[PDB]
Amino acid sequence: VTCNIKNGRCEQFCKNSADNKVVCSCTEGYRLAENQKSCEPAVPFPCGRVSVSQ
Amino acid sequence: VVGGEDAKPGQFPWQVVLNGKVDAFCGGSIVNEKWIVTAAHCVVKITVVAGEHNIEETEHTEQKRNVIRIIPHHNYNAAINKYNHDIALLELDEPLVLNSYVTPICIADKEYTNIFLKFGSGYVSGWGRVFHKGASALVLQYLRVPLVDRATCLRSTKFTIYNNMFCAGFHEGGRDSCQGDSGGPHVTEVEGTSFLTGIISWGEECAMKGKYGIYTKVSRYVNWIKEKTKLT
Ligand code: NA
């Protein structure tokens, strides 16, 4: 489990941490989810997201 | 964009169009409610339109704003080379109202912006010409372009390509950015979230076999973008 393997399973950003663990993170307007890997919107219109029905 | 497809409304909600003496002379991307990032060679009185889809139809998602400040990158010098350090920021007169049609593009740090460019596939969009020396698009066009290796990119043109630029496109031609798309976004989708990886800059002949589109590497400028456009 390292950031160089599948991004540490982080959806957006990964940082290597202590004891062979990783810390995931997200860009502005998102919150790191309870699963510790995913990025969830934390504002009404977060960056880079398509929200109109396609 | 040559060889692209019509976007659906709200498919590229960070895209803006720059209008001047000619409409759709360049593109740009929304950094936040008050700031647009574009190419420095694009930027006279400029009107920015966010929420645009069909440039010949007055729809209901468009937000038009005036530009109050132009910040070309401090290393940009058009007297030396119109296309080196080809990036600029535009401050809008009044903030955009963010919604499903008017949404910023994400901008990662330098390291991740470079990682995302290394994925090798980005989307470009714009209202530029739909053929080399052809008409501009009415409906926003988009196209997925693959990253081209550096040596191939250098062998394709007589002009010097520095390490702050990259090439993208197809060996067979037929699909490329074109005039009027300059300044718009090259974005990489990361698990459903798009990140800005390049600025559409220039080329010699749109979609010509053996030629490629040239783009500004955004990773080199993210710190400058974040500092200049910070709202808090
Ligand atoms: Na329109």
Side-chain angles (χ1 to χ4, degrees):
Chain A
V1 171
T2 77
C3 299
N4 279 31
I5 302 162
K6 300 190 263 197
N7 206 45
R9 301 188 156 80
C10 302
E11 185 179 325
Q12 290 179 14
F13 314 134
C14 185
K15 181 182 171 56
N16 289 305
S17 195
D19 302 305
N20 309 125
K21 303 301 182 191
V22 302
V23 169
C24 302
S25 68
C26 314
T27 195
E28 184 64 32
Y30 291 87
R31 154 185 68 83
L32 185 67
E34 286 186 54
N35 71 6
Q36 318 205 339
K37 301 304 187 175
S38 306
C39 294
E40 297 304 329
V43 299
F45 296 102
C47 68
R49 186 162 182 102
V50 174
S51 54
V52 174
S53 176
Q54 303 290 298
Chain B
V1 179
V2 183
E5 294 174 277
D6 287 8
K8 292 182 169 53
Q11 187 177 349
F12 297 92
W14 44 83
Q15 176 80 48
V16 306
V17 63
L18 307 191
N19 294 328
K21 290 284 134 180
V22 173
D23 289 325
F25 71 82
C26 276
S29 303
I30 301 169
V31 175
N32 62 39
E33 50 262 49
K34 279 282 279 187
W35 288 94
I36 304 303
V37 62
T38 190
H41 84 264
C42 292
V43 299
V44 75
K45 185 187 189 56
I46 302 155
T47 296
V48 169
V49 190
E52 188 55 285
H53 185 248
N54 184 324
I55 59 173
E56 196 174 69
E57 296 194 2
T58 305
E59 309 156 287
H60 289 272
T61 60
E62 300 95 327
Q63 291 183 40
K64 303 186 164 44
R65 296 295 186 277
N66 305 295
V67 171
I68 63 173
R69 190 182 299 281
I70 298 161
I71 312 175
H73 188 265
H74 41 93
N75 300 166
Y76 187 67
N77 185 340
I80 303 166
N81 186 344
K82 178 174 172 80
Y83 304 98
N84 183 31
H85 300 293
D86 195 18
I87 192 171
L89 296 164
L90 316 175
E91 194 181 358
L92 302 177
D93 67 324
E94 297 289 345
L96 293 170
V97 168
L98 304 182
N99 62 37
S100 289
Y101 300 93
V102 177
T103 299
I105 189 61
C106 302
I107 304 179
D109 68 11
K110 175 183 188 186
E111 170 173 42
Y112 263 100
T113 299
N114 188 226
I115 290 171
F116 300 157
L117 183 65
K118 295 178 175 164
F119 287 7
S121 182
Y123 284 82
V124 299
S125 47
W127 290 269
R129 298 185 188 266
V130 301
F131 298 107
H132 179 63
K133 298 177 160 184
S136 292
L138 295 198
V139 174
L140 182 63
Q141 299 294 289
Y142 77 100
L143 173 69
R144 181 195 78 78
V145 289
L147 184 64
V148 170
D149 77 277
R150 187 172 166 281
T152 297
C153 160
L154 264 56
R155 286 167 203 281
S156 79
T157 176
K158 74 194 181 173
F159 301 106
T160 298
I161 307 300
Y162 306 129
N163 295 323
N164 62 353
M165 303 164 217
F166 66 95
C167 295
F170 293 87
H171 306 336
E172 298 292 306
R175 283 179 277 179
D176 203 358
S177 56
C178 199
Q179 195 177 35
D181 295 321
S182 302
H186 172 284
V187 307
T188 297
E189 200 179 40
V190 182
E191 308 291 343
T193 302
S194 293
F195 285 84
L196 190 66
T197 43
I199 308 301
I200 302 170
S201 190
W202 64 275
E204 286 167 81
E205 193 171 2
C206 313
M208 175 60 174
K209 184 164 180 170
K211 297 297 221 174
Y212 300 99
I214 316 301
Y215 297 79
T216 300
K217 269 185 199 176
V218 162
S219 67
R220 296 296 201 275
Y221 307 102
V222 298
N223 293 335
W224 169 84
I225 299 169
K226 292 272 183 204
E227 284 182 31
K228 296 299 184 183
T229 66
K230 204 178 192 294
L231 301 184
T232 66

Coordinates of all heavy atoms in Angstrom, one line a residue, chain A residues 3 7 10-15 27-28 30 45-54, chain B residues 8-11 14 98-101 103-106 108 112 190-195:
Chain A
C3 N 1.6 5.2 -2.4 CA 1.0 6.0 -3.4 C 1.5 5.7 -4.8 O 0.8 6.2 -5.7 CB 1.3 7.5 -3.1 SG 0.7 8.0 -1.5
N7 N -2.2 4.8 -7.0 CA -2.4 6.0 -6.2 C -2.8 5.8 -4.8 O -3.5 6.6 -4.2 CB -3.5 6.9 -6.9 CG -3.3 8.4 -6.6 OD1 -2.2 8.9 -6.6 ND2 -4.4 9.0 -6.2
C10 N -6.4 6.0 -3.5 CA -7.0 7.4 -3.3 C -7.6 7.8 -4.6 O -7.0 7.7 -5.7 CB -5.9 8.3 -2.9 SG -5.0 7.9 -1.4
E11 N -8.8 8.4 -4.5 CA -9.5 8.9 -5.7 C -8.8 10.0 -6.4 O -8.8 10.2 -7.6 CB -10.9 9.3 -5.3 CG -11.8 9.7 -6.5 CD -13.2 10.1 -6.1 OE1 -13.8 9.6 -5.2 OE2 -13.8 10.9 -6.9
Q12 N -8.2 11.0 -5.6 CA -7.5 12.2 -6.1 C -6.1 12.2 -5.7 O -5.3 11.7 -6.6 CB -8.2 13.5 -5.7 CG -9.6 13.6 -6.5 CD -10.3 14.8 -6.1 OE1 -9.8 15.8 -5.5 NE2 -11.6 14.9 -6.5
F13 N -5.7 12.5 -4.5 CA -4.3 12.7 -4.1 C -3.9 11.7 -3.0 O -4.7 11.3 -2.2 CB -4.0 14.1 -3.7 CG -4.6 15.2 -4.5 CD1 -5.2 16.3 -4.0 CD2 -4.5 15.1 -5.9 CE1 -5.7 17.3 -4.8 CE2 -5.0 16.1 -6.7 CZ -5.6 17.2 -6.2
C14 N -2.6 11.3 -3.0 CA -2.1 10.4 -2.1 C -0.8 10.9 -1.5 O 0.0 11.5 -2.2 CB -1.9 9.1 -2.8 SG -1.3 7.7 -1.7
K15 N -0.6 10.7 -0.2 CA 0.6 11.0 0.5 C 1.1 9.8 1.3 O 0.3 9.2 2.0 CB 0.4 12.1 1.5 CG 1.6 12.6 2.3 CD 1.2 13.7 3.3 CE 2.4 14.0 4.2 NZ 3.6 14.3 3.5
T27 N -9.0 17.8 -3.7 CA -8.9 19.2 -4.1 C -9.9 20.1 -3.4 O -10.8 19.6 -2.7 CB -8.9 19.4 -5.6 OG1 -8.5 20.7 -6.0 CG2 -10.3 19.1 -6.2
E28 N -9.8 21.4 -3.5 CA -10.7 22.4 -2.9 C -12.1 22.1 -3.3 O -12.4 21.8 -4.4 CB -10.3 23.8 -3.3 CG -11.1 24.9 -2.7 CD -11.0 25.1 -1.2 OE1 -9.9 24.8 -0.7 OE2 -11.9 25.5 -0.6
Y30 N -14.0 19.6 -2.0 CA -14.3 18.2 -1.7 C -13.8 17.8 -0.3 O -13.0 18.5 0.2 CB -13.5 17.3 -2.7 CG -14.1 17.4 -4.1 CD1 -13.6 18.3 -5.0 CD2 -15.0 16.5 -4.6 CE1 -14.0 18.5 -6.3 CE2 -15.5 16.7 -5.9 CZ -15.0 17.6 -6.7 OH -15.6 17.7 -8.0
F45 N -21.2 23.5 -5.9 CA -20.7 23.3 -7.2 C -19.2 23.2 -7.2 O -18.5 24.1 -7.6 CB -21.1 24.6 -8.1 CG -22.6 24.6 -8.2 CD1 -23.4 25.5 -7.5 CD2 -23.3 23.7 -9.0 CE1 -24.7 25.5 -7.5 CE2 -24.7 23.7 -9.0 CZ -25.4 24.6 -8.2
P46 N -18.8 22.0 -6.8 CA -17.3 21.7 -6.7 C -16.7 21.7 -8.1 O -17.4 21.4 -9.1 CB -17.2 20.4 -6.1 CG -18.4 19.7 -6.5 CD -19.5 20.8 -6.4
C47 N -15.4 22.1 -8.2 CA -14.7 22.1 -9.4 C -14.7 20.8 -10.2 O -14.8 19.7 -9.6 CB -13.3 22.6 -9.2 SG -12.2 21.4 -8.3
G48 N -14.6 20.9 -11.5 CA -14.4 19.7 -12.3 C -15.4 18.7 -12.4 O -15.2 17.6 -13.1
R49 N -16.6 19.0 -12.0 CA -17.7 18.0 -11.9 C -18.8 18.4 -13.0 O -19.2 19.6 -13.1 CB -18.3 18.1 -10.5 CG -19.4 17.1 -10.2 CD -19.5 17.0 -8.7 NE -20.5 16.0 -8.3 CZ -20.2 14.8 -7.8 NH1 -18.9 14.3 -7.7 NH2 -21.2 14.0 -7.3
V50 N -19.2 17.4 -13.7 CA -20.3 17.5 -14.6 C -21.5 17.2 -13.8 O -21.7 16.0 -13.4 CB -20.2 16.7 -15.9 CG1 -21.5 16.8 -16.8 CG2 -19.0 17.1 -16.7
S51 N -22.5 18.1 -13.6 CA -23.7 17.9 -12.8 C -25.0 17.9 -13.7 O -26.0 17.3 -13.2 CB -23.7 18.9 -11.7 OG -23.6 20.2 -12.1
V52 N -24.9 18.5 -14.9 CA -26.1 18.5 -15.8 C -26.3 17.1 -16.3 O -25.3 16.5 -16.7 CB -26.0 19.5 -16.9 CG1 -27.1 19.4 -17.9 CG2 -25.8 20.9 -16.5
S53 N -27.6 16.7 -16.4 CA -27.8 15.4 -17.0 C -27.3 15.3 -18.4 O -27.6 16.2 -19.2 CB -29.3 15.1 -17.0 OG -29.6 13.9 -17.7
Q54 N -26.5 14.2 -18.7 CA -25.9 14.0 -20.0 C -26.7 12.9 -20.7 O -26.4 12.7 -21.9 CB -24.5 13.6 -19.9 CG -23.6 14.7 -19.1 CD -23.5 15.9 -19.9 OE1 -22.9 15.9 -21.0 NE2 -24.0 17.1 -19.4
Chain B
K8 N -22.7 18.4 -25.0 CA -24.0 18.6 -24.6 C -23.9 19.8 -23.7 O -22.9 20.1 -23.1 CB -24.4 17.4 -23.8 CG -24.6 16.1 -24.6 CD -25.0 14.9 -23.9 CE -25.4 13.8 -24.9 NZ -24.4 13.5 -25.9
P9 N -25.1 20.5 -23.4 CA -25.1 21.6 -22.5 C -24.6 21.1 -21.1 O -24.9 20.0 -20.6 CB -26.6 22.0 -22.4 CG -27.1 21.6 -23.8 CD -26.4 20.3 -24.1
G10 N -23.7 21.9 -20.5 CA -23.1 21.7 -19.2 C -22.1 20.6 -19.2 O -21.6 20.2 -18.1
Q11 N -21.6 20.1 -20.4 CA -20.6 19.0 -20.4 C -19.2 19.5 -20.0 O -18.4 18.8 -19.5 CB -20.6 18.3 -21.7 CG -19.8 17.1 -21.8 CD -19.8 16.4 -23.1 OE1 -20.6 16.6 -23.9 NE2 -18.9 15.4 -23.2
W14 N -16.7 24.6 -17.2 CA -15.5 25.5 -16.9 C -15.1 26.2 -18.2 O -14.3 27.2 -18.1 CB -14.3 24.7 -16.4 CG -14.1 23.4 -17.2 CD1 -13.4 23.2 -18.4 CD2 -14.6 22.1 -16.9 NE1 -13.5 21.9 -18.8 CE2 -14.2 21.2 -17.9 CE3 -15.3 21.6 -15.8 CZ2 -14.5 19.9 -17.9 CZ3 -15.7 20.2 -15.8 CH2 -15.3 19.4 -16.9
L98 N -21.8 30.6 -9.6 CA -21.5 29.2 -10.0 C -22.8 28.3 -9.9 O -23.7 28.5 -9.1 CB -20.5 28.6 -9.0 CG -19.1 29.3 -9.0 CD1 -18.2 28.6 -8.0 CD2 -18.5 29.6 -10.3
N99 N -22.9 27.4 -10.9 CA -24.1 26.5 -11.1 C -23.7 25.4 -12.0 O -22.5 25.2 -12.3 CB -25.3 27.3 -11.6 CG -25.1 27.9 -12.9 OD1 -24.5 27.3 -13.8 ND2 -25.7 29.1 -13.1
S100 N -24.6 24.5 -12.3 CA -24.3 23.3 -13.1 C -23.7 23.7 -14.5 O -23.0 22.8 -15.1 CB -25.5 22.5 -13.3 OG -25.8 21.8 -12.1
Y101 N -23.9 24.9 -15.0 CA -23.4 25.3 -16.3 C -22.2 26.2 -16.2 O -21.5 26.5 -17.3 CB -24.5 26.1 -17.0 CG -25.7 25.2 -17.2 CD1 -26.8 25.2 -16.3 CD2 -25.8 24.4 -18.4 CE1 -27.9 24.3 -16.5 CE2 -26.9 23.5 -18.6 CZ -27.9 23.5 -17.6 OH -29.0 22.7 -17.8
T103 N -19.0 26.3 -13.7 CA -18.3 25.5 -12.7 C -16.8 25.6 -12.9 O -16.4 25.5 -14.1 CB -18.7 24.0 -12.8 OG1 -20.1 23.8 -12.6 CG2 -18.0 23.1 -11.8
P104 N -16.0 25.8 -11.9 CA -14.5 25.9 -12.1 C -13.9 24.6 -12.5 O -14.5 23.5 -12.3 CB -14.0 26.3 -10.7 CG -15.2 26.9 -10.0 CD -16.4 26.1 -10.5
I105 N -12.8 24.7 -13.2 CA -12.0 23.5 -13.5 C -11.1 23.3 -12.2 O -10.6 24.3 -11.6 CB -11.1 23.7 -14.7 CG1 -10.4 22.3 -15.1 CG2 -10.1 24.8 -14.6 CD1 -11.3 21.2 -15.5
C106 N -10.8 22.0 -11.8 CA -9.9 21.8 -10.7 C -8.5 22.0 -11.1 O -8.1 21.7 -12.3 CB -10.0 20.4 -10.2 SG -11.7 19.9 -9.6
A108 N -4.8 20.9 -9.6 CA -4.0 20.2 -8.6 C -2.7 20.9 -8.4 O -2.4 21.9 -9.1 CB -3.7 18.8 -9.2
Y112 N 0.9 16.6 -9.0 CA -0.2 15.9 -9.5 C -0.7 16.4 -10.9 O -1.2 15.6 -11.7 CB -1.4 15.9 -8.5 CG -1.4 14.6 -7.7 CD1 -0.9 14.6 -6.4 CD2 -1.9 13.4 -8.2 CE1 -0.7 13.4 -5.7 CE2 -1.8 12.3 -7.5 CZ -1.3 12.3 -6.2 OH -1.3 11.1 -5.5
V190 N -10.1 12.5 -13.9 CA -9.6 11.6 -12.8 C -10.8 11.1 -12.0 O -11.3 11.9 -11.2 CB -8.6 12.4 -12.0 CG1 -8.0 11.6 -10.9 CG2 -7.5 13.1 -12.9
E191 N -11.2 9.9 -12.3 CA -12.3 9.3 -11.5 C -13.6 10.3 -11.5 O -14.1 10.5 -10.5 CB -11.9 8.9 -10.1 CG -10.6 8.1 -10.0 CD -10.8 6.6 -10.6 OE1 -11.9 6.2 -10.7 OE2 -9.7 6.0 -10.7
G192 N -13.9 10.9 -12.6 CA -15.1 11.7 -12.8 C -14.9 13.2 -12.4 O -15.9 14.0 -12.4
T193 N -13.7 13.6 -12.1 CA -13.4 15.0 -11.7 C -12.3 15.5 -12.7 O -11.2 14.8 -12.8 CB -12.9 15.1 -10.3 OG1 -13.9 14.6 -9.4 CG2 -12.6 16.6 -9.9
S194 N -12.6 16.6 -13.4 CA -11.6 17.1 -14.4 C -10.7 18.1 -13.8 O -11.0 19.0 -13.0 CB -12.3 17.7 -15.6 OG -13.0 16.7 -16.3
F195 N -9.4 17.9 -14.2 CA -8.3 18.8 -13.8 C -7.6 19.4 -15.0 O -7.5 18.8 -16.0 CB -7.2 17.9 -13.0 CG -7.6 17.5 -11.6 CD1 -8.4 16.4 -11.4 CD2 -7.3 18.3 -10.5 CE1 -8.9 16.1 -10.1 CE2 -7.7 18.0 -9.2 CZ -8.5 16.9 -9.0

